[PDB]
Amino acid sequence: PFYDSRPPEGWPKGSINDMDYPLLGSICAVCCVFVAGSGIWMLYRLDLGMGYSCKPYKSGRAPEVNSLSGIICLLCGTMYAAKSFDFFDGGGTPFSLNWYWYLDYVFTTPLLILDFAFTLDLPHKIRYFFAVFLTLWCGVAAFVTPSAYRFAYYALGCCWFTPFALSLMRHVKERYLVYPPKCQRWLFWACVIFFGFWPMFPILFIFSWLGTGHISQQAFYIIHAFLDLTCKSIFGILMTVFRLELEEHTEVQGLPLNE
Amino acid sequence: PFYDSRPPEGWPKGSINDMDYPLLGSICAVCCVFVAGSGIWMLYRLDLGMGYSCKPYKSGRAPEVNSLSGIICLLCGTMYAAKSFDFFDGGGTPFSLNWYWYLDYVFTTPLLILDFAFTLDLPHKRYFFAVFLTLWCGVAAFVTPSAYRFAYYALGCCWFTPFALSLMRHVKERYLVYPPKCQRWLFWACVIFFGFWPMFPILFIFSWLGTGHISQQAFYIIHAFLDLTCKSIFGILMTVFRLELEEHTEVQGLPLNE
Amino acid sequence: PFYDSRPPEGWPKGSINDMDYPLLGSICAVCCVFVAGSGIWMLYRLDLGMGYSCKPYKSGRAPEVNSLSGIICLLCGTMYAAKSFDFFDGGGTPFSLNWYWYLDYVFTTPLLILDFAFTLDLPHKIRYFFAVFLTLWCGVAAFVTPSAYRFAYYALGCCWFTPFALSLMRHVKERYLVYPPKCQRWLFWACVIFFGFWPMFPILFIFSWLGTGHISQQAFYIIHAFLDLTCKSIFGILMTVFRLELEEHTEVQGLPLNE
Ligand SMILES: *C/C=C(C)/C=C/C=C(C)/C=C/C1=C(C)CCCC1(C)C
Ligand SMILES: *C/C=C(C)/C=C/C=C(C)/C=C/C1=C(C)CCCC1(C)C
Ligand SMILES: *C/C=C(C)/C=C/C=C(C)/C=C/C1=C(C)CCCC1(C)C
Ligand SMILES: [K+]
Ligand SMILES: [K+]
Ligand SMILES: [K+]
Ligand SMILES: [K+]
Ligand SMILES: [K+]
Ligand SMILES: [K+]
Ligand SMILES: [K+]
Ligand SMILES: [K+]
Ligand SMILES: [K+]
Ligand SMILES: [K+]
Ligand SMILES: [K+]
Ligand SMILES: [K+]
Ligand SMILES: [K+]
Ligand SMILES: [K+]
Ligand SMILES: [K+]
Ligand SMILES: [K+]
Ligand SMILES: [K+]
Ligand SMILES: [K+]
Ligand SMILES: [K+]
Ligand SMILES: [K+]
Ligand SMILES: [K+]
Ligand SMILES: [K+]
Ligand SMILES: [K+]
Ligand SMILES: [K+]
């Protein structure tokens, strides 16, 4: 999709691409290591067995959808390795996963909500997947649109995120009472991350360089690196622990849910 | 994928991009509203229950593949909102869903046939990929400036002609299964399918990339109407056919003619 | 994604794009015909029935995942028809499936391993799919990166292919003892192709024009056309014959596996 490139003399001074690229690349490398290691741990723990007792699977293999968390974390870590490669090369690299904002997210966070929908047995998994997909593509369109119509694209995304986030919460609540108090605690701390960090992205858009102009692109990159460390890595860890508690309750102890 | 952009002085006069952009944007906005509302109604009606009696689902939720029609209509409505944004900005916008013809279709109409294959229990749900490939052969045909675009078009005609011939046959095998009311709804859906899908290849020949009889603006209006028919009306007809099928088999418990 | 195009006077002499385009287009057309015909035969044979006896399916239709081999071969044949169109037009065509190396592969070979995972009942089908996906995208990034960081991208791909290829082999071995000796023979000849031709691509990268500079882009195109004739077409034929023998053993004769 690329047309632009870093000028031979470098990015013009004062432009949004005139960033601290060694620092951004170091942050991206650290994020890559952390998120990829978290995904590797999730896959290894999933292969260990069901619950904290590590009860062997009857088929000898874990459910395929249960690998979604670790797969998403490993894909995010690989894209952050690519981001570190792009930043350490000075930015504007032909294969830049940093250039088009939220283009990487159209790969992780839809699958992520799918994983969430598979972990909580949430209804309308395809509906939630496509809502997140369209919201992220509206964000990509807003960040590639140089006119005021980007605020239209943003609004379009806000027309896809506000219902979804309102629906998901409701559905999440319907599942929350089902689970035992310990799984409820893990789910509570995962939903705190979800419903307190997903709304941050729309707010960050308004104060970014494409909005009120209060947040620079470098600060945007650092903020979104921390958000991906939270929304992918920490949220996936919390989902893995919630799954372990649910399996210990229902598969190891055989106890029924509060449904 | 974009390399081109609207020139600072505007699109050159007499070029294919020198179109009535306020009119195209208004048409795209109306299409967005209509198709998105149709998808919202499809999802709401699906959540209402099975059949016309709105029989509650045993699990409390509808089948996931049954949301395909409304999801496709909502995705098409969102892409038409993006198209209206592009047209109202004068065209040639970096995120232009109007520039690359049939690029948007690679997202809807494959899923659409999937929905169709899921609604009629059609074999080789193959079909999807065939449509996929066909549409990509269209995309290339509209980005190739040489005569080899007619090769790409022909390649698509080598993927659409068998598929459309196979689908019909398979559709016929399912048509006798369904009751006469579901048969009526299926008949009116298949009329749209087999009478409007062939239009796109014919429209290619007489477009600016063929005989030069249809301008790009007329192409946009024609395809807006076609998307209003192939996505919106066809999805409505499929929803009504599903409602009749559920009323026959799930509410009344009657068996199919299989 | 295209920015470049063939210059009005043609590709500069001595450049990597200054290739024998009629020859490349003829090779691509022959490959298209062969691979598309192999996919058509695979789908027709699948529709014939189970096993060598062509036992009719109970539902009257074959399993959907069993069409993966023929679908992949037909998609590869269509992409090779597009490649022949691009080459016969002189290269650098806006819809060039030859320009971005391994970009076409991100469409076939993941599905291919999925097909493999479905044919051998291999665990972690999604994990293998995403590993191949990420390896191929790392290859695409390496072949679009003009700096030394391409060797980083390559290494990233080598960090995704080496574990996967090591895991797959192990899992394949666990399945190999299950199957009867005839299915074992067909599986052996398919795994020979897999584990002896998939490692070739990383080695070909090193000696290509983006590495040591020993293999030209034209030679790369011919080599990869032959590899796609082997990895898609011949491997799909071997998988179809293995499936036919397995169905003759288990569905026609009703005999159990060595599990
Ligand atoms: C790990 C990454 C995550 C969880 C990304 C989440 C993204 C969103 C909640 C998207 C937000 C936006 C929309 C509401 C539309 C306007 C633009 C965005 C992308 C900032
Ligand atoms: C709502 C949109 C629909 C139903 C689109 C349908 C598209 C086709 C039937 C595709 C037609 C073409 C081919 C046969 C190949 C040549 C190029 C196309 C895209 C016009
Ligand atoms: C029919 C095509 C096939 C089987 C393609 C296979 C591709 C690979 C085994 C990929 C190899 C590479 C990686 C290990 C990363 C570095 C770059 C590649 C793409 C050469
Ligand atoms: K995760
Ligand atoms: K996991
Ligand atoms: K990322
Ligand atoms: K990007
Ligand atoms: K940028
Ligand atoms: K970005
Ligand atoms: K799960
Ligand atoms: K997760
Ligand atoms: K629809
Ligand atoms: K629907
Ligand atoms: K559309
Ligand atoms: K487009
Ligand atoms: K155009
Ligand atoms: K278009
Ligand atoms: K359906
Ligand atoms: K539909
Ligand atoms: K194959
Ligand atoms: K096949
Ligand atoms: K190919
Ligand atoms: K390409
Ligand atoms: K090239
Ligand atoms: K290539
Ligand atoms: K299979
Ligand atoms: K195969």
Side-chain angles (χ1 to χ4, degrees):
Chain A
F2 243 120
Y3 176 91
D4 322 276
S5 49
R6 186 184 54 87
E9 59 288 352
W11 294 114
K13 248 69 182 139
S15 66
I16 61 152
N17 298 297
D18 185 58
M19 299 176 297
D20 192 341
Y21 283 104
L23 159 87
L24 281 181
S26 290
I27 291 164
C28 274
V30 168
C31 286
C32 154
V33 171
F34 186 85
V35 184
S38 78
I40 287 157
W41 170 85
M42 299 165 204
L43 292 189
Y44 148 87
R45 195 48 189 84
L46 177 72
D47 290 333
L48 275 198
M50 274 159 327
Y52 301 117
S53 276
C54 297
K55 192 180 159 212
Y57 295 95
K58 205 52 155 312
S59 42
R61 46 183 79 169
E64 303 258 355
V65 281
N66 287 22
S67 315
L68 269 184
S69 324
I71 277 159
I72 289 150
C73 268
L74 275 153
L75 158 84
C76 176
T78 321
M79 302 193 291
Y80 265 93
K83 288 170 189 256
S84 164
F85 298 158
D86 161 77
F87 276 148
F88 275 133
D89 214 5
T93 293
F95 202 92
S96 183
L97 290 188
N98 293 299
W99 196 259
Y100 302 107
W101 281 91
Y102 312 107
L103 186 48
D104 55 313
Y105 289 169
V106 315
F107 307 120
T108 49
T109 103
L111 282 173
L112 190 98
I113 186 89
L114 212 51
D115 180 51
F116 201 42
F118 274 118
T119 316
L120 261 62
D121 206 14
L122 293 168
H124 324 123
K125 307 192 178 33
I126 311 185
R127 285 192 217 181
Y128 283 131
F129 178 91
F130 271 105
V132 179
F133 195 70
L134 285 196
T135 308
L136 293 164
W137 272 114
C138 293
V140 170
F143 268 86
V144 302
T145 305
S147 46
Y149 282 89
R150 74 188 179 264
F151 300 124
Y153 280 120
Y154 173 76
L156 189 57
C158 283
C159 281
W160 267 108
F161 188 59
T162 307
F164 145 81
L166 281 175
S167 186
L168 211 245
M169 191 138 29
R170 206 186 101 261
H171 283 152
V172 162
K173 255 130 101 164
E174 280 164 5
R175 299 298 299 151
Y176 189 85
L177 326 169
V178 174
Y179 296 119
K182 1 265 277 74
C183 326
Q184 262 176 1
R185 168 207 28 201
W186 300 122
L187 187 50
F188 171 79
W189 278 116
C191 294
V192 157
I193 292 190
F194 212 110
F195 300 108
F197 286 79
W198 285 53
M200 295 179 165
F201 301 90
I203 302 159
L204 284 157
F205 172 85
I206 304 163
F207 303 102
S208 71
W209 68 101
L210 283 182
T212 332
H214 289 139
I215 311 165
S216 60
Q217 198 181 223
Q218 183 194 315
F220 227 60
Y221 277 122
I222 306 165
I223 287 161
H224 282 60
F226 293 171
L227 288 171
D228 289 7
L229 207 101
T230 305
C231 286
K232 281 85 209 193
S233 199
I234 298 166
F235 173 85
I237 288 153
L238 278 160
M239 280 345 276
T240 299
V241 180
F242 164 82
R243 221 177 291 119
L244 287 179
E245 265 266 7
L246 193 54
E247 292 156 345
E248 186 87 353
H249 186 83
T250 63
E251 313 263 35
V252 178
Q253 278 154 245
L255 302 178
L257 289 179
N258 325 321
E259 173 75 297
Chain B
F2 243 120
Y3 176 91
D4 321 275
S5 49
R6 186 184 54 87
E9 59 288 352
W11 294 114
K13 249 71 185 139
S15 66
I16 61 152
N17 298 297
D18 178 53
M19 308 181 281
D20 192 341
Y21 283 104
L23 162 89
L24 281 181
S26 317
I27 290 164
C28 274
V30 168
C31 286
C32 154
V33 171
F34 187 85
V35 184
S38 78
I40 287 157
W41 170 85
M42 287 171 216
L43 293 189
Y44 148 86
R45 195 48 189 84
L46 177 72
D47 290 333
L48 275 198
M50 274 159 327
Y52 297 117
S53 280
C54 297
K55 192 180 159 212
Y57 295 95
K58 204 60 155 292
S59 42
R61 46 183 80 169
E64 307 256 2
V65 281
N66 291 17
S67 319
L68 269 184
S69 324
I71 277 159
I72 289 150
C73 268
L74 275 153
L75 157 82
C76 176
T78 317
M79 296 187 300
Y80 265 94
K83 288 170 189 256
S84 164
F85 298 158
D86 161 81
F87 276 148
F88 276 133
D89 214 5
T93 286
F95 202 92
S96 183
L97 290 188
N98 293 299
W99 196 259
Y100 302 107
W101 281 91
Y102 311 106
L103 182 55
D104 55 313
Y105 289 170
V106 314
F107 307 120
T108 50
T109 101
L111 282 173
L112 189 98
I113 192 85
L114 214 51
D115 181 59
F116 201 42
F118 274 118
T119 314
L120 261 62
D121 205 21
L122 293 168
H124 324 303
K125 307 192 179 34
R126 282 195 216 184
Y127 277 132
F128 175 92
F129 268 105
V131 183
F132 193 70
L133 285 204
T134 306
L135 292 162
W136 276 112
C137 296
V139 169
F142 275 82
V143 302
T144 306
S146 46
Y148 282 90
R149 74 188 180 264
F150 300 124
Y152 280 118
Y153 170 82
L155 191 55
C157 283
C158 281
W159 267 108
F160 182 70
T161 306
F163 143 81
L165 281 175
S166 186
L167 213 241
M168 192 134 36
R169 206 186 100 261
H170 283 152
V171 162
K172 255 130 101 164
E173 278 160 9
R174 299 298 299 151
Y175 189 85
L176 330 171
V177 174
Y178 296 119
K181 1 269 276 73
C182 326
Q183 261 176 1
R184 168 207 28 201
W185 299 120
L186 187 49
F187 171 79
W188 278 115
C190 294
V191 157
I192 291 190
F193 209 108
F194 299 107
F196 286 79
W197 285 53
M199 291 179 178
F200 301 89
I202 302 157
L203 284 157
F204 173 86
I205 304 162
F206 303 102
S207 72
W208 68 101
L209 281 187
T211 329
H213 290 319
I214 311 165
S215 60
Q216 198 181 223
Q217 186 194 304
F219 226 61
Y220 277 122
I221 306 165
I222 287 161
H223 282 59
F225 293 170
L226 288 178
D227 289 7
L228 206 100
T229 305
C230 287
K231 281 85 209 193
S232 204
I233 310 175
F234 174 85
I236 288 153
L237 278 160
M238 279 344 272
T239 300
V240 179
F241 163 82
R242 221 177 290 119
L243 286 183
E244 277 263 11
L245 196 54
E246 293 159 338
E247 186 87 353
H248 187 83
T249 62
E250 311 261 35
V251 178
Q252 275 149 236
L254 302 178
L256 289 179
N257 324 321
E258 173 75 297
Chain C
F2 243 120
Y3 176 91
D4 321 279
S5 49
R6 186 184 54 87
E9 59 288 352
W11 294 114
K13 244 77 200 151
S15 66
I16 61 152
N17 298 297
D18 183 56
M19 314 178 279
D20 192 341
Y21 283 104
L23 161 89
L24 281 181
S26 290
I27 291 164
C28 274
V30 169
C31 286
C32 154
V33 171
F34 186 86
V35 184
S38 78
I40 287 157
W41 170 85
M42 284 171 222
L43 292 190
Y44 148 87
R45 195 48 189 84
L46 178 72
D47 290 333
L48 275 198
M50 278 157 324
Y52 301 116
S53 273
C54 297
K55 192 180 159 212
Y57 295 95
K58 204 59 155 302
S59 42
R61 46 183 79 169
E64 304 263 359
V65 282
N66 283 25
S67 313
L68 269 184
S69 324
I71 279 159
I72 289 149
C73 268
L74 275 153
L75 156 77
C76 176
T78 321
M79 299 191 298
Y80 265 93
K83 288 170 189 256
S84 164
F85 298 158
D86 160 82
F87 276 148
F88 276 133
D89 214 5
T93 287
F95 202 91
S96 183
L97 290 188
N98 293 299
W99 196 259
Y100 302 107
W101 281 91
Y102 312 107
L103 182 56
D104 55 313
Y105 289 169
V106 316
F107 307 120
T108 49
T109 103
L111 283 172
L112 191 98
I113 186 89
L114 212 51
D115 183 51
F116 201 42
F118 273 118
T119 315
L120 261 62
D121 205 17
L122 293 168
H124 324 303
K125 307 192 178 33
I126 309 184
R127 285 192 217 181
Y128 283 130
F129 178 91
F130 271 105
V132 179
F133 195 70
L134 287 203
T135 308
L136 293 163
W137 272 114
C138 293
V140 170
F143 264 92
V144 302
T145 305
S147 46
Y149 282 90
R150 74 188 179 263
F151 301 124
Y153 280 120
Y154 172 77
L156 190 57
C158 282
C159 281
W160 267 107
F161 182 69
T162 306
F164 143 81
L166 280 176
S167 186
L168 209 247
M169 179 126 45
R170 200 185 110 261
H171 283 152
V172 162
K173 255 130 101 163
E174 280 164 5
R175 298 299 299 160
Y176 189 85
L177 330 173
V178 174
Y179 296 119
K182 357 272 275 72
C183 326
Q184 262 176 1
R185 168 207 28 201
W186 300 122
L187 187 50
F188 171 79
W189 278 115
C191 295
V192 157
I193 291 190
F194 209 109
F195 300 108
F197 286 79
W198 285 53
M200 287 183 53
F201 301 90
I203 309 178
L204 284 157
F205 172 85
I206 304 163
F207 303 102
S208 71
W209 68 101
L210 283 183
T212 329
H214 290 319
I215 311 165
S216 61
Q217 198 181 223
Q218 186 194 309
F220 227 60
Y221 277 122
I222 306 165
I223 287 161
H224 282 60
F226 294 168
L227 289 176
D228 289 7
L229 208 99
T230 305
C231 286
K232 281 85 209 193
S233 200
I234 295 160
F235 174 85
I237 288 153
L238 278 160
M239 279 344 272
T240 300
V241 180
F242 164 82
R243 221 177 291 119
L244 287 177
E245 196 95 41
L246 193 54
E247 294 156 344
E248 186 87 353
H249 186 83
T250 62
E251 313 269 32
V252 178
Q253 274 146 242
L255 302 177
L257 289 179
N258 324 322
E259 173 76 300

